[PDB]
RNA sequence: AAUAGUGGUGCUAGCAUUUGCUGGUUAUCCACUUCUUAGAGGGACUAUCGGUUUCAAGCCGAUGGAAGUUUGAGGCAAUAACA
RNA sequence: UGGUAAUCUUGUGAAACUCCGUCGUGCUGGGGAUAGAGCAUUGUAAUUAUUGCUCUUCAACGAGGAAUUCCUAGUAAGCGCAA
């Protein structure tokens, strides 16, 4: 019966809109109070490294990339409602977290 | 309530939001009157939307604009983008269209980039 | 001074070691029956005014 | 401003310890013509001199040419800090002094010649540089 | 003419004849003056101007190049070497500090003194820029008008730099005397006396 | 450390992975780095 | 050092067309601040009809 | 007919204000104002011999006007120059702190600017009824 | 959309004051998405007219248009003696 | 103190440029190249100056012979000071 907050920061964007849909699905079949999935600015990683094992040759480089997407939802529910549904929305590559911060 | 609308104008990643209200007529560039902008040579570039149609239609208005971003040169171009297109929202929500197009024709006869912002973004190098 | 007030009619082509000059067809305004070519250097188009001095001595073609 | 017309009385040659100054310039630029004193040093002493900061040689009071070396010869007497000096905490006496034009060469050779020949208090491999490659 | 007021206290002096069809803050564009028949087409862009600074898009087809204003063009040429590439704000300060020093030198129209000046300095003849295939010669040739105006303005500009290099006088003092020298046929300025000798040897070679 | 392929220099100290860059081009796939631009 | 800053300027001011720092340095004794203080004195004298002025330069003419 | 601080000149408004402060003389002016310059990056103590201490102290009040709070690190990273390094390329200036530490404390004695609970020194109703009121005294300089 | 922002209602300070223009901050509360961020889609095809050419592939102007230089920039693509 | 991260550093108040001044064309206040005196920090340890702030000293250097160029319209050039 406490306001909670869930985060999920994954790297397969197709496998994050199935999870964020079924989160808001079973909450709205029980019709709790909620606020929509707020989508944060994504983070990209990069490292320039030149493309030769030895050093003998012409010079330009590579650039590698890795994309991290992160979005989070706030929620309030009785604890018996939420403690079951957070255990049936598992999927590989996906991270789930629960925050009950009510300072 | 009061007739009120929002416009915005960009140049080279420099934004300029606008708030239009109705009143005696105050034109506020980020909390200051418009006659004090520090590139003193470019002071008349901001005067150009006002000095095209006459000083008439402004005893029923109120203008508050605020900017971010860009350098000391682009922000002069950014404010007159939102201001000039800010006047037409009155005349496209409240006042009729024959009053709209006569200044629409007056602006774009003189400056195509007073209504439509430029499209000349930068470019990556040695990649 | 002996002016030669001229008007280009037809463009023909560039010629030269680099094609830096262009041969056109030009007309004299004061005598509208003067078909003559001219080795004009520069960006050229229709309907231009051409100052000129030597009204007759001109190379009809170049290598 | 105005037109002030004085009767010349300007000295193309000065005499402040063998320093002959073309004094048709600013007086802080006049002192910089001597050695050991620059515009980072001469800046405050004319401000210590309490005069006009635009004058030429033809208008200077005659006591002040005595005064400027008097503040110079008594550096720490009239509020000069420790970070406003050339020669500081000496290896021979530990005291702190400044230098005029014709004696920067003093405390120079004798202080290098010990590092040049005697293999001195620090100079034993600082012993060939101003001797073999930069003598 | 009936100075209306707003909640902003607006000065009147920006509204007197500026709200009237006079446009530039000190001069106008009624003064239209044609000397050559070549300049009738494109140089005097009949449009208003206030500051002579805009983002022209003319550099992606060679004839939209013609439609930019003349006063905009001369300011563009002031970026000369590796110290003034991109100091456009410095340049317009120079130019608006030159029309004032033009009109106080016993004349009638400060924008007039340059539009007649380029009539003289558009070189009517030319050499060719070829050797000839070993025999490094110079043959019969003439100049296009849209090329003619380009080199016309530029040789006036470059003389002023060395005219103001390393001497006490300023840039605006040079551009004053140079253009009134260029206004008449005098050949006493370097802006003139290098285009003349080009045309004189062109009267030889051909 | 010297990891593998004749390298104790040019290590990638960033992001806390510490790989010799000769032996990064063949391992950058399965870490999940990929080139796109 | 009394007359050269007294007769060529206090009497022969209105002879020219306009006044800048160019005319005042025609004597090799009148230096930069000396030429600068000339107009700085003369603006009090009212002969200067000013046109425009900023920190790099002025545009001044006589009465 | 009533103005804020925001609708006056920028450079000129400081000049008329500090000249009034030049008539005041109520400043703890330390002894070493002759020697110590503004930063390390500048080359010389300024051509102003006296009024520069009035100059910086006026404008620091001018900058806390629009702002919420000012510490000391901010006006260090403020003061208009470029560090020369000689033959090596340039770098940005950073300003000295001792000449700013006391002149921020030199206005608490006259009821202008004081510590916010958020952690910076800001104006309160002491200046908000007086510093604007003497900015309203600059309106006489508008004519 | 308190991990972005404005729009009010307030507590609240200036205020020329007199209607007013600047402030005021946790929570004074409510209402908002234009600007912001990220998902889902849309939009440009050289469109439409005028020239030109074996009337063909196309190329030049034109007005519209956020955009008319492959729309701007990259990534990706195996025949070969550097033992 | 604050910050495991749009919340904190950080609006990363960057520089050129911008007004008001001082300066006056001389290799002068342009240009600081070798240097001696000093105070600091980092590690087990800085002499052969690891770097950094003081004051001094200001020495080649007046646009470059014959030759020859990683960089394409928000492009060439300046100006950054982020990993």
Swiss-Prot record, chain A:
GO cellular-component term (any): cytoplasm
Reported function: Component of the ribosome, a large ribonucleoprotein complex responsible for the synthesis of proteins in the cell. The small ribosomal subunit (SSU) binds messenger RNAs (mRNAs) and translates the encoded message by selecting cognate aminoacyl-transfer RNA (tRNA) molecules. The large subunit (LSU) contains the ribosomal catalytic site termed the peptidyl transferase center (PTC), which catalyzes the formation of peptide bonds, thereby polymerizing the amino acids delivered by tRNAs into a polypeptide chain.
An example molecular function term from Gene Ontology annotations: mRNA binding
Subcellular location: Cytoplasm
Covalent cross-link (Glycyl lysine isopeptide (Lys-Gly) (interchain with G-Cter in ubiquitin)), residues: 3, 14, 83
Highest taxon listed in the record's lineage: Eukaryota
Keywords: Acetylation, Cytoplasm, Isopeptide bond, Ribonucleoprotein, Ribosomal protein, Ubl conjugation
Assembly information from the UniProt record: Component of the small ribosomal subunit (SSU). Mature yeast ribosomes consist of a small (40S) and a large (60S) subunit. The 40S small subunit contains 1 molecule of ribosomal RNA (18S rRNA) and 33 different proteins (encoded by 57 genes). The large 60S subunit contains 3 rRNA molecules (25S, 5.8S and 5S rRNA) and 46 different proteins (encoded by 81 genes).
Signal peptide: none
Pfam families the UniProt entry points to: Ribosomal_S10 (PF00338)
GO biological process: cytoplasmic translation; maturation of SSU-rRNA from tricistronic rRNA transcript (SSU-rRNA, 5.8S rRNA, LSU-rRNA)
Modification note: N-terminally acetylated by acetyltransferase NatA. Also partially acetylated by NatC.
Curated annotation (Swiss-Prot), chain C:
Complex and partners: Component of the small ribosomal subunit (SSU). Mature yeast ribosomes consist of a small (40S) and a large (60S) subunit. The 40S small subunit contains 1 molecule of ribosomal RNA (18S rRNA) and 33 different proteins (encoded by 57 genes). The large 60S subunit contains 3 rRNA molecules (25S, 5.8S and 5S rRNA) and 46 different proteins (encoded by 81 genes).
GO molecular function, one term: structural constituent of ribosome
Cellular component terms per the entry's GO annotation: cytosol; cytosolic small ribosomal subunit
Note: Present with 94500 molecules/cell in log phase SD medium. There are 2 genes for eS28 in yeast.
Pfam assignment, any one: Ribosomal_S28e
Organism: Saccharomyces cerevisiae (strain ATCC 204508 / S288c)
Keywords recorded for this protein, A-Z: Acetylation, Cytoplasm, Ribonucleoprotein, Ribosomal protein
InterPro entries from the UniProt entry: NA-bd_OB-fold, Ribosomal_eS28, Ribosomal_eS28_CS
General function of this protein: Component of the ribosome, a large ribonucleoprotein complex responsible for the synthesis of proteins in the cell. The small ribosomal subunit (SSU) binds messenger RNAs (mRNAs) and translates the encoded message by selecting cognate aminoacyl-transfer RNA (tRNA) molecules. The large subunit (LSU) contains the ribosomal catalytic site termed the peptidyl transferase center (PTC), which catalyzes the formation of peptide bonds, thereby polymerizing the amino acids delivered by tRNAs into a polypeptide chain.
CDD domains (alphabetical): S1_S28E
Location(s) in or outside the cell: Cytoplasm
Keyword Iron: no
Signal peptide extent: none
UniProtKB/Swiss-Prot annotation, chain E:
GO MF entry, a single one: rRNA binding
UniProt keyword annotation of Cell cycle present: no
CDD domains cross-referenced by the UniProt entry: uS7_Eukaryote
GO CC list: 90S preribosome; cytoplasm; cytosol; cytosolic small ribosomal subunit; ribosome
Principal place of residence: cytoplasm
Post-translational modification comment from the UniProt entry: N-terminally acetylated by acetyltransferase NatA.
Keyword set includes Cytoplasm: yes
InterPro entries: Ribosomal_uS7 (IPR000235), Ribosomal_uS7_CS (IPR020606), Ribosomal_uS7_dom (IPR023798), Ribosomal_uS7_dom_sf (IPR036823), Ribosomal_uS7_euk/arc (IPR005716)
Coiled-coil segments: none
Family annotation (Pfam families): Ribosomal_S7
BP-aspect Gene Ontology terms: cytoplasmic translation; maturation of SSU-rRNA; regulation of translational fidelity; ribosomal small subunit assembly; ribosomal subunit export from nucleus; translation
Phosphothreonine modification, residue list: 8
Free-text function comment from the UniProt entry: Component of the ribosome, a large ribonucleoprotein complex responsible for the synthesis of proteins in the cell. The small ribosomal subunit (SSU) binds messenger RNAs (mRNAs) and translates the encoded message by selecting cognate aminoacyl-transfer RNA (tRNA) molecules. The large subunit (LSU) contains the ribosomal catalytic site termed the peptidyl transferase center (PTC), which catalyzes the formation of peptide bonds, thereby polymerizing the amino acids delivered by tRNAs into a polypeptide chain.
Family: Belongs to the universal ribosomal protein uS7 family.
UniProt-listed NCBIfam families: PRK04027.1 (NF003106), uS7_euk_arch (TIGR01028)
Protein name stated in the entry: Small ribosomal subunit protein uS7
Organism of derivation: Saccharomyces cerevisiae (strain ATCC 204508 / S288c)
Gene that produces this protein: RPS5
Curated annotation (Swiss-Prot), chain H:
Function of the protein: Component of the ribosome, a large ribonucleoprotein complex responsible for the synthesis of proteins in the cell. The small ribosomal subunit (SSU) binds messenger RNAs (mRNAs) and translates the encoded message by selecting cognate aminoacyl-transfer RNA (tRNA) molecules. The large subunit (LSU) contains the ribosomal catalytic site termed the peptidyl transferase center (PTC), which catalyzes the formation of peptide bonds, thereby polymerizing the amino acids delivered by tRNAs into a polypeptide chain.
GO molecular function, one term: structural constituent of ribosome
Keyword Cytoplasm tagged: yes
Outcome of swapping residue 101 to E: Decreases mature 18S rRNA, protein binds 20S pre-RNA complex poorly. Lethal in double RPS19A/RPS19B mutant
GO cellular component term, pick one: cytosol
Record protein name field: Small ribosomal subunit protein eS19A
Subcellular location: Cytoplasm
SMART domains attached to this UniProt entry: Ribosomal_S19e
Annotated source species: Saccharomyces cerevisiae (strain ATCC 204508 / S288c)
Mutation effect (residue 121 to E): Decreases mature 18S rRNA, protein binds 20S pre-RNA complex poorly. Lethal in double RPS19A/RPS19B mutant
Miscellaneous comment text of the record: Present with 29000 molecules/cell in log phase SD medium. There are 2 genes for eS19 in yeast.
Signal peptide as annotated in the record: none
Keywords: Cytoplasm, Ribonucleoprotein, Ribosomal protein, Ribosome biogenesis
Upper lineage: Eukaryota, Fungi, Dikarya, Ascomycota, Saccharomycotina
Similarity section: Belongs to the eukaryotic ribosomal protein eS19 family.
Gene (name only): RPS19A
């Amino acid at each position: 019966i406490i306001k909670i907050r869930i985060t999920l920061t994954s790297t397969k964007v197709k496998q994050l809109e199935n999870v964020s849909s079924n989160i808001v699905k079973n909450a709205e079949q029980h019709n709790l109070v909620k606020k929509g999935p707020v989508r944060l600015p994504t983070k990209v990683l990069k490292i320039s490294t030149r493309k030769t094992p030895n050093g003998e040759g012409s010079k330009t480089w590579e650039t590698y990339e890795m994309r991290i997407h992160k979005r989070y939802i706030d929620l309030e529910a009785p604890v018996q409602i939420v403690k079951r549904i957070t255990q049936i929305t598992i999927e590989p590559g996906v991270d789930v977290e629960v925050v009950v911060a009510s300072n | 309530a009061v007739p009120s609308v929002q416009t915005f104008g960009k140049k080279k990643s420099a934004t300029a939001v606008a708030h239009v209200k109705a009143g005696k007529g105050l034109i506020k560039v980020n909390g200051s009157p418009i006659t004090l902008v520090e590139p003193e040579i470019l002071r008349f570039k901001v005067y150009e939307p006002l000095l095209l149609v006459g000083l008439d239609k402004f005893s029923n208005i109120d203008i508050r604009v605020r900017v971010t971003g860009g350098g000391h040169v682009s922000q002069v171009y950014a404010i007159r983008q939102a201001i000039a297109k800010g006047l037409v929202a009155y005349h496209q929500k409240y006042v009729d269209e024959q009053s709209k197009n006569e200044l629409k024709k007056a602006f774009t006869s003189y400056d195509r980039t007073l209504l439509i912002a430029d499209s000349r973004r930068p470019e990556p190098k040695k990649f | 001074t002996p002016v030669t007030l001229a008007k280009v009619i037809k463009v023909l082509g560039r010629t030269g070691s680099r094609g830096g000059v262009t041969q056109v067809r030009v007309e004299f305004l004061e005598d509208t029956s003067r078909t003559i070519v001219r080795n004009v250097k520069g960006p050229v188009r229709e309907n231009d005014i051409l100052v000129l001095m030597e009204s007759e001595r001109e190379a009809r073609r170049l290598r | 401003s105005l037109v002030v017309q004085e009767q010349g009385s300007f000295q193309h040659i000065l005499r402040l310890l063998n320093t002959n100054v073309d004094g048709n310039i600013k007086i802080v630029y006049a002192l910089t013509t001597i050695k050991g004193v620059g515009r980072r040093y001469s800046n405050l002493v004319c401000k210590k001199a309490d005069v006009d900061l635009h004058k030429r040689a033809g208008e200077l009071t005659q006591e002040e040419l005595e005064r400027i070396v008097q503040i110079m010869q008594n550096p720490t007497h009239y509020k000069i800090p420790a970070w406003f000096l050339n020669r500081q905490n000496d290896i021979t006496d530990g005291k702190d002094y400044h230098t005029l034009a014709n004696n920067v060469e003093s405390k120079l050779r004798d202080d290098l010649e010990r590092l040049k020949k005697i293999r001195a208090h620090r100079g034993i491999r600082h012993f060939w540089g101003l001797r073999v490659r930069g003598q | 003419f009936t100075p209306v007021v707003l909640a902003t206290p607006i000065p009147e002096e920006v509204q007197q004849a500026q709200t009237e069809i006079k446009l530039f803050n000190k001069w106008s564009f009624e003064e239209v003056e044609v000397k050559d028949a070549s300049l009738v087409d494109y140089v005097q862009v009949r449009q208003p101007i206030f500051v002579a600074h805009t983002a022209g898009r003319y550099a992606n087809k060679r004839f939209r190049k013609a439609q930019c204003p003349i006063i905009e063009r001369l300011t563009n040429s002031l970026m000369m070497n590796g110290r003034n590439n991109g100091k456009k704000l410095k340049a317009v300060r120079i130019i608006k500090h030159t029309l004032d020093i033009i009109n106080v030198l016993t004349d009638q129209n400060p924008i007039q003194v340059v539009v007649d000046a380029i009539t003289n300095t558009g070189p009517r003849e030319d050499t060719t820029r070829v050797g000839g295939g070993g025999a490094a010669r110079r043959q019969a040739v003439d100049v296009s008008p849209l090329r003619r105006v380009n080199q016309a303005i530029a040789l006036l500009t470059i003389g002023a730099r060395e005219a103001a290099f390393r001497n006490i006088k300023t840039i605006a003092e040079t551009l004053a005397e140079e253009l009134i020298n260029a206004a008449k046929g005098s050949s006493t300025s370097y802006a003139i006396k290098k285009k003349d000798e080009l045309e004189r040897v062109a009267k030889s070679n051909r | 450390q010297c990891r593998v392929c004749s390298s104790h220099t040019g290590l990638i100290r960033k992001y806390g992975l510490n790989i010799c860059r000769q032996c990064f081009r063949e391992k950058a796939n399965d870490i999940g780095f990929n080139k796109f631009r | 050092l009394d007359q050269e800053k007294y007769d060529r300027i206090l009497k022969e001011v209105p002879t020219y067309r306009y006044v800048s720092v160019s005319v005042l340095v025609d004597r090799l004794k009148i230096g930069g601040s000396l030429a600068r203080i000339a107009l700085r004195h003369l603006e009090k004298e009212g002969i200067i009809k000013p046109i425009s002025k900023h920190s790099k330069q002025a545009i001044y003419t006589r009465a | 007919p009533g103005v804020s601080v925001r609708d006056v000149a920028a450079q000129d408004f400081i000049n008329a204000y500090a000249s009034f402060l030049q008539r005041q003389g109520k400043l703890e002016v330390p002894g070493y104002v002759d020697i110590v310059k503004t930063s390390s990056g500048n080359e010389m103590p300024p051509q102003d011999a006296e009024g520069w201490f009035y100059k910086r102290a006026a404008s620091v009040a001018r900058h806390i006007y629009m702002r919420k709070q000012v510490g000391v690190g901010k006006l260090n990273k403020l003061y208009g120059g470029a560090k020369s390094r000689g033959v090596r390329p340039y770098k940005h200036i950073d300003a000295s702190g001792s000449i700013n530490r006391k002149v921020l404390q030199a206005l608490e004695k006259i009821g202008i600017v004081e510590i916010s609970p958020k952690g910076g020194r800001r104006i309160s109703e002491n200046g908000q009824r007086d510093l604007d009121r003497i900015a309203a005294q600059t309106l006489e300089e508008d004519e």
